[PDB]
Amino acid sequence: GIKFSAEALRCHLRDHVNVSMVEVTDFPFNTSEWEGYLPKESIRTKAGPWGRCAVVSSAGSLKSSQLGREIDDHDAVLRFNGAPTANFQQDVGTKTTIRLMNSQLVTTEKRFLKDSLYNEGILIVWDPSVYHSDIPKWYQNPDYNFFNNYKTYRKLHPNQPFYILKPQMPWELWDILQEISPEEIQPNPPSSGMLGIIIMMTLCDQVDIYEFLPSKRKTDVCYYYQKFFDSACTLLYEKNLVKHLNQGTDEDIYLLGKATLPGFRTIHC
Numbered sequence: 001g002i003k004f005s006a007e008a009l010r011c012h013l014r015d016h017v018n019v020s021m022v023e024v025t026d027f028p029f030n031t032s033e034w035e036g037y038l039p040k041e042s043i044r045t046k047a048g049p050w051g052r053c054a055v056v057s058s059a060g061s062l063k064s065s066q067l068g069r070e071i072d073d074h075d076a077v078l079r080f081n082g083a084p085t086a087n088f089q090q091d092v093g094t095k096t097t098i099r100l101m102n103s104q105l106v107t108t109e110k111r112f113l114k115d116s117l118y119n120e121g122i123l124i125v126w127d128p129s130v131y132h133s134d135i136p137k138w139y140q141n142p143d144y145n146f147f148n149n150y151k152t153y154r155k156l157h158p159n160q161p162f163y164i165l166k167p168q169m170p171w172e173l174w175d176i177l178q179e180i181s182p183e184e185i186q187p188n189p190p191s192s193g194m195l196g197i198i199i200m201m202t203l204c205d206q207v208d209i210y211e212f213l214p215s216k217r218k219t220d221v222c223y224y225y226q227k228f229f230d231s232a233c234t235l236l237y238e239k240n241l242v243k244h245l246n247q248g249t250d251e252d253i254y255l256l257g258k259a260t261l262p263g264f265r266t267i268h269c
Contacts, residue, residue, distance in 0.1 A: 002180045002181075002240065002241070002244050003180065004180065006244055006245050007267070007268075009176075009180070009241075009244065009245060010245060010262070010264070010267045010269075011267060011269035012176060012179075013173075013176060013198065013201070013264075014264045014267065014269065015269070016172055016175065016176060017169060017172040017173050017176065017198055018166065018168065018169060018172060019169060019198060019199055019202040020166050020169070021039075021042070021043055021124070021163040021164060021165060021166060022038060022135065022163070022164040022165075022166055023038065023042075024038045024040055026135050027135070027136055028135075028136060028139055029135075037150070037151055037154050038163075038164070039161050039162065039163060041161075043122065043124075043161070043163050044203070046122060046161050047076070047097070047098060047122055047203050048075070048076065048203040048204060049203060049204070049205075049265065050075040050076045050203055050204045050205070051075050051204070051205050051206065052073075052074045052075055052204070052205065052206050052208070053074050053075055053076045053077070053078070053097075053200045053203070053204035053206070053207050053208070053263075054071050054074040054076070054077045054078070054093070054207075054208045054209075054210060055077075055078045055193070055196050055197055055200050055207060055208070055209045055210065055212070056071055056077060056078070056079050056080075056083070056092055056093065056210050056211070057080070057193055057209075057210060057211045057212045058079070058080050058081065058083040058222075058223050058224060058225075059211040059212075059214065059219075059222075059223070059224065059257075060217075060219045060220070060221025060222055060223055060224050060226060061211045061214050061215055061217035061218050061219050061221075061224075061257060062088075062091050062092050062210070062211050062217075062224040062257075063088075063091060063217070063219075063221070063224040064091065064217065065091050065092075065210075065211070065215070065217060065256075065257065066090055066091060067091060067092065067093070067210055067211075067256065067257070068088075068089050068090045068091055068092060068093045068094065069093075070208075070210075070256065070258075071092060071093030071210060072093045072094055072095055074208065075097075075204070076097035076098065076200075076203070076204065077093060077095050077096055077097050077098075078097065078098040078099070078100060078196050078199065078200050079092075079096050079098075079099050079100075080099070080100055080101070080192050080193065080196060081099075081100075081101050081102060081105050081192065082101075082105060082109065082111065082112070082115070082117065082118075083223070083224075083225065084117050084225055085117070086117065088224060088225065091224065092224065095120075095121075096117075096120045096121045097121045097122065098121055098122045098123075098124065098196075098199070098200075099118065099120075099121055099122070099123050099124070100124045100126070100192055100195060100196045100199065101123065101124065101125045101126075101192075102125070102126060102127075102144075102192055103125055103126065103127035103128075103142060103143060103144040103146040104143075104144045105125075106125050106144070106146040106149050106150060106153075107144035107145060107146040107149060108144065112149065112153070113149065113152060113153060113156070118153075119157060119160060121160075122160075122161045122162075122163070123160065123161070123162040123163070124162075124163045124164075124165055124199070125146060125150065125162070125163075125164055125165070126164070126165035126169075126170065126192070126195065127142045127143050127144060127146060127164075127165075127167065128143040128170065128189045129142075129143070129167035129168075129170075129171070131171050131174075132171065133167060134167075134168075135166070135167060138167040150162070150164070165195070169195070170189040170190050170195060171189065173190050173194065173195065173198060174189060174190055177190065177237055177238070177241065180237075180241065181237035181240065181241075184236065184237050185237060186235065190238065191235070191238060193212055193238070194238045194241075194242075197209060197212070197242065197261065200263070201261060201262075201263045201264050202263070202264055203263070204263045204265075205262070205263045205265055205266050206260060206261070206262055206263060206266075207260070207261045207262075207263060208258055208259070208260050209242065209258070209259045209260070209261065210256070210257055210258055211257035212239070212242060212257075212259065213239055213242060213243060213246075213253050213257065213259050214257060215253065215254060215255065215256060215257030215258075216254055216255065217257065220233075221233070242259055242261070243259070245259075245261045245262075246259040246260060246261065247260050247261065247262060248260035
């Protein structure tokens with residue numbers, strides 16, 4: 001079991017996980033090849049600070065949840081990868097403030113450069129790095145080399161903020177997951193969902209998280225927008241961390257798939 005209190009764990013996450021994006025001053029993003037591409041204004045100036053926020057998983061258990069009104073009743077909503085709102089608004093809501101994407105999508109999903117769903121809100125892309133690599137080392141061999149499509153998208157949509165997560169952040173979070181669940185942790189980086197939760201805890205006073213802890217609608221359908229099973233649909237310690245930090249009721253998990261986590265601005269350390 002987790003050895004820290006919820007209060008101590010939030011302080012540990014606040015102090016040990018640096019939620020920051022690559023900046024124009026980080027070599028090699030200050031080379032001529034990168035001139036003008038990265039946002040010059042920090043995400044913290046464009047995103048909040050906010051009072052109440054939602055993180056919406058892409059889970060199949062959002063189908064028929066009718067959570068759309070509950071989700072939209074927030075200052076900001078974070079979604080993942082290519083999760084759509086069109087044709088699903090009654091279940092997942094209408095607005096998208098931040099969209100966190102893995103580098104596999106930006107690199108290999110041709111619809112990223114075509115589909116209008118990406119053009120709303122603030123985009124963040126992240127790429128798994130070697131553990132304890134710095135930015136210049138990671139740059140030399142990204143997991144998925146998304147840089148060309150990043151640049152192409154930036155040119156198509158120059159006024160949409162589009163950030164790159166620093167490579168160190170997922171492994172800083174992994175370190176805390178290991179500290180509290182050492183016998184079970186796997187050497188994969190944290191899920192995008194877990195990263196999105198910590199991102200919103202940095203920008204918001206309260207984070208409502210929908211269908212990360214599964215409700216009564218739990219299902220082996222991977223995505224609420226899935227039409228059938230294919231190669232896209234063939235971890236306990238992340239869910240346990242979120243449960244440990246949850247300030248909401250057990251009924252809200254079962255009925256709404258809803259956890260409620262306080263943001264870092266509001267905690268005392």
